Amino acid sequence: RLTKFTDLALRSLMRLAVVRDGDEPLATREVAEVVGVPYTHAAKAITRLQHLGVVEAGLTLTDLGRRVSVGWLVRELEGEAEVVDCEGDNPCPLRGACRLRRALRDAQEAFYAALDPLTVTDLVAAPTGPVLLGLTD
Amino acid sequence: RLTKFTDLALRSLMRLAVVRDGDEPLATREVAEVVGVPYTHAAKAITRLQHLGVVEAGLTLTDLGRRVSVGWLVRELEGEAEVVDCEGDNPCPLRGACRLRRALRDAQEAFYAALDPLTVTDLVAAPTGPVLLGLTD
Ligand code: SF4
Ligand code: SF4
Ligand SMILES: [Cl-]
Ligand SMILES: [Cl-]
């Protein structure tokens, strides 16, 4: 499962990607209302996207924002989280001699590689882009 | 992220896969001690694996248990959970016109397909199988 935070960050970028140059740099508020979350959640997401350099401005998508891959974004946004936790409160005795762990690393790489060919631009092509714009009508 | 329950079910199968024919059908207890969890957690996992038909017996791996793919097991064990929740407490307005959702479906399929070539047999090949047996020494 992907984090709510990761998905929401992606939603926010999608919303910023449909801004027709010379429409308006959106406020965080407008973004949060349109993508259907509270302000506070959207606020976190935007500040992170600013940390990453994919947004700036009033808010805008950067040169970088348009061209980065969705794979890269998810990798960055997922941050620390791993596919499995081999040492939580009760750490696993197979740690370090685990063939399953290796397989899950390969599987998780397959996941990100399926997303490397896409950009946010590709995600706001139709039908999605129109619906976002539709939601600001 | 994979569920603790899914990983633990896989741990339990791995433990059952190293039983040298005519060693001993393990009790749930022995499995839970060896894979490093409480009895109650292991108990759930085993009953599910019995529902799926990959274990039986005193506990044993079935004919089916040896040959099923790790991909199939994870798909079954993950059950209901989806890659993203497009309708939780605050459902997403992009539902049904979301290019991101489609991409994440492709990504998640890439994840399982990386695991389709493996079986539990492949996971308890070395170094893992020896360590499990080592943990019953
Ligand atoms: S069984 Fe393997 S992947 Fe699962 S927690 Fe243990 S070391 Fe990690
Ligand atoms: S942005 Fe797309 S994938 Fe994310 S919750 Fe909304 S419909 Fe689902
Ligand atoms: Cl490893
Ligand atoms: Cl869909």
Residue numbers in the entry:
A (entry chain A), B (entry chain A): 2 to 58, 65 to 144
Can you quote the paper on this entry?
The most widespread dedicated NO sensor regulator in bacteria is NsrR, a member of the Rrf2 superfamily of homodimeric transcriptional regulators. NsrR proteins from Bacillus subtilis (Bs) and Streptomyces coelicolor (Sc) have been shown to bind a [4Fe–4S] cluster, which functions as the NO sensing module. In ScNsrR, reaction with NO was shown to result in loss of the iron–sulfur (Fe–S) cluster and formation of iron-nitrosyl species. This process led to loss of high affinity DNA-binding and activation of genes that were previously repressed by [4Fe–4S] (holo-)ScNsrR, including those encoding Hmp-type NO detoxifying enzymes.
We report here the 1.95 Å resolution crystal structure of holo-ScNsrR, the first for an Fe–S cluster-bound form of any Rrf2 superfamily regulator. ScNsrR crystallized as a dimer spanning a distance of about 80 Å, with monomers being related by a crystallographic twofold axis. Nevertheless, the polypeptide chain was resolved for 137 of its 148 amino acid residues and forms two loosely interacting domains (residues 1–85 and 86–144, see Methods section). Another similarity to other Rrf2 superfamily members is the highly hydrophobic nature of the ScNsrR dimerization interface, which buries a surface of about 2,050 Å2 per monomer. Unique to the holo-ScNsrR structure is the presence of a [4Fe–4S] cluster that is ligated by three cysteine residues (Cys93, Cys99 and Cys105) from one monomer and Asp8 from the other. The latter forms a salt bridge with Arg12 from the same α1 helix, which also interacts with the carbonyl oxygen of Val36 of the DNA-binding helix-turn-helix (HTH) motif. At the opposite side of the cluster Cys93 is exposed to solvent. The more buried Cys99 and Cys105 Sγ atoms are hydrogen-bonded to the main chain N atoms of Leu101 and Arg108, respectively. Otherwise, the cluster environment is mainly hydrophobic, without H-bonds to the inorganic S atoms of the cluster. Holo-ScNsrR appears to be the first structurally characterized protein with a [4Fe–4S] cluster that is asymmetrically bound by ligands from two different subunits as indicated by our examination of all the other [4Fe–4S] cluster-containing protein structures found in the Protein Data Bank18.
